Paper text:
The cannabinoid-1 and -2 receptors (CB1R and CB2R), both members of the lipid family of G protein coupled receptors (GPCRs), are the primary mediators of cannabinoid activity. Based on these expression profiles, and supported by animal studies, CB1R is thought to be the major target involved in the psychotropic and tetrad effects of cannabinoids, as well as their analgesic effects in tests of nociception, though because of the high similarity of the two receptors, and the peripheral distribution of CB2R, a role for the latter receptor often cannot be discounted without direct testing. The CB1R orthosteric site is large and lipophilic, explaining the high molecular weight and hydrophobicity of many of its ligands. In this work, we computationally dock a library of 74 million virtual but readily accessible molecules against human CB1R, revealing a range of different scaffolds with relatively favorable physical properties.
To understand the SAR of ‘1350 at atomic resolution, and to template future optimization, we determined the cryo-EM structure of the ‘1350-CB1R-Gi1 complex to a nominal resolution of 3.3 Å. Consistent with earlier structures of human CB1R in its activated state, the ligand occupies the orthosteric pocket formed by transmembrane helices (TMs) 2–3 and 5–7 and is capped by ECL 2. The experimental structure of ‘1350 superposes well on the docking-predicted pose of the R-enantiomer, which was the enantiomer with the better docking score to the receptor (-43 DOCK3.7 score versus -38 DOCK3.7 score for the S-enantiomer). In optical rotation studies, ‘1350 was shown to be the (-) enantiomer, together identifying ‘1350 as the R/(-) enantiomer. The predicted and experimental structures superposed with an all-atom RMSD of 0.78 Å. Despite the local resolution limit that prevents unambiguously modelling all rotamers, the density suggests that major interactions with CB1R predicted by the docking are likely preserved in the experimental structure, including the key hydrogen-bond between the amide carbonyl of the ligand and S3837.39. The trifluoromethyl group is complemented by van der Waals and quadrupole interactions with residues W2795.43 and T1973.33, as anticipated by the docked structure, and consistent with the improvement in affinity by -1.7 kcal/mol (‘51486 Ki = 731 nM vs. ‘60154 Ki = 44 nM, 17-fold increased Ki from CF3 addition only) on its replacement of the original fluorine. Key learnings from the SAR include the importance of bulky and hydrophobic groups in the R1 position, which is modeled to pack against W2795.43 and T1973.33, with a meta-substituted CF3 being most favorable. Further, methylation of the chiral center (R4 position, ‘1350, ‘4936, ‘5806) meaningfully improved affinity (approximately 6-fold in ‘4936, 15-fold in ‘5806, and 50-fold in ‘1350). This addition is predicted to increase van der Waals interactions between the ligands and transmembrane helix 2.
Numbering used by the authors: 108 to 141, 148 to 253, 266 to 313, 335 to 411
């Protein structure tokens, strides 16, 4: 149901116009400097999956709580299928840049023969054909026409794909550390300190943007609900427009190719 406040419904309209117009105007310019090599496809399909997920959401959320509107059982679930298929096509893309950066230090001899363009152009096809086959899937407390046996399906997939990202960046910081002993001290503390101040920022902008909201969404299935948790889920849902703005500050800015190609044109 739709009860937040009459008082806390006049600041989100100003907040979503400043955390909503930059994420459009940054994920567009990033796709205006792409150049294309088979690990720059995976960074491209999460700069197009965060320009669509920030228009359907900013149009539905400003419609449902501030100035009011009603719907039906087939009109409403169609707009809800455009924020469910665009928030798991922005997490499955974070699962492909952490499986591409894992077959480059674990088997560094084979990264120009395993990961080729015939297996990196079909790979993002088999995510957009599973994320719209589990978001049209309703063929059948806070989400109106949704039964509780379906919120134990979406959370149980988005959680196990965030436990292959906090393992695929804690094996690059162990393999580049034992290696750091030999080709520095014996070989001729230099290499594992330039990968320990960017690789800690990727894991502290992910656990504070998929950890509060994936906890409240468990408190429905895992027991009773109440009144004051319905008013704080409407501010714990604007974190998704915070983890759409910082993504081209961590993946596009932190490079030597995308920052020099920009400089020349
Ligand atoms: C109560 O809903 C809403 O009024 C809105 C504003 N939507 C949200 O508030 C919202 C906020 C978030 C973070 N999600 C989300 C994201 C992924 C998956 C799921 C689900 F449904 F599969 F569990 C939900 N939905 C929408 C109305 C019409 C389209 S959206």
């Amino acid at each position: 149901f739709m009860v937040l406040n009459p008082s806390q419904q006049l600041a989100i309209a100003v907040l979503s116009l400043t955390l909503g117009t930059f994420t459009v105007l940054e994920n567009l310019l990033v796709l205006c400097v792409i150049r294309c090599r088979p690990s720059y496809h995976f960074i491209g399909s999460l700069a197009v999956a965060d320009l669509l997920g920030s228009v359907i959401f900013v149009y539905s959320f400003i419609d449902f709580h501030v100035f009011h509107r009603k719907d039906s059982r087939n009109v409403f679930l169609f707009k809800l299928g455009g924020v469910t298929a665009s928030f798991t096509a922005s997490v499955g893309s974070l699962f492909l840049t952490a499986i591409d950066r894992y077959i480059s230090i674990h088997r560094p001899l084979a990264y120009k023969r395993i990961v080729t363009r015939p297996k990196a152009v079909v790979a993002f096809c088999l995510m957009w054909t599973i994320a719209i086959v589990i978001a049209v899937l309703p063929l059948l407390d806070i989400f109106p026409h949704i039964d509780e046996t379906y919120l134990m399906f979406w959370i149980g997939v988005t959680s196990v794909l965030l436990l292959f990202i906090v393992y695929a960046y804690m094996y690059i910081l162990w393999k580049a550390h034992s290696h750091a002993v030999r080709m520095i001290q014996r070989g001729t503390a230099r290499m594992d300190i330039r990968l320990a101040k960017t690789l800690v920022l990727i894991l502290v902008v992910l656990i504070i943007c998929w950890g509060p909201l994936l906890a409240i969404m468990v408190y429905d299935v895992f027991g009773k609900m109440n009144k004051l948790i319905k008013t704080v889920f409407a501010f714990c849902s604007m974190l998704c427009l915070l983890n759409s703005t910082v993504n081209p500050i961590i993946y596009a800015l932190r490079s030597k190719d995308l920052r020099h190609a920009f400089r020349s044109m």
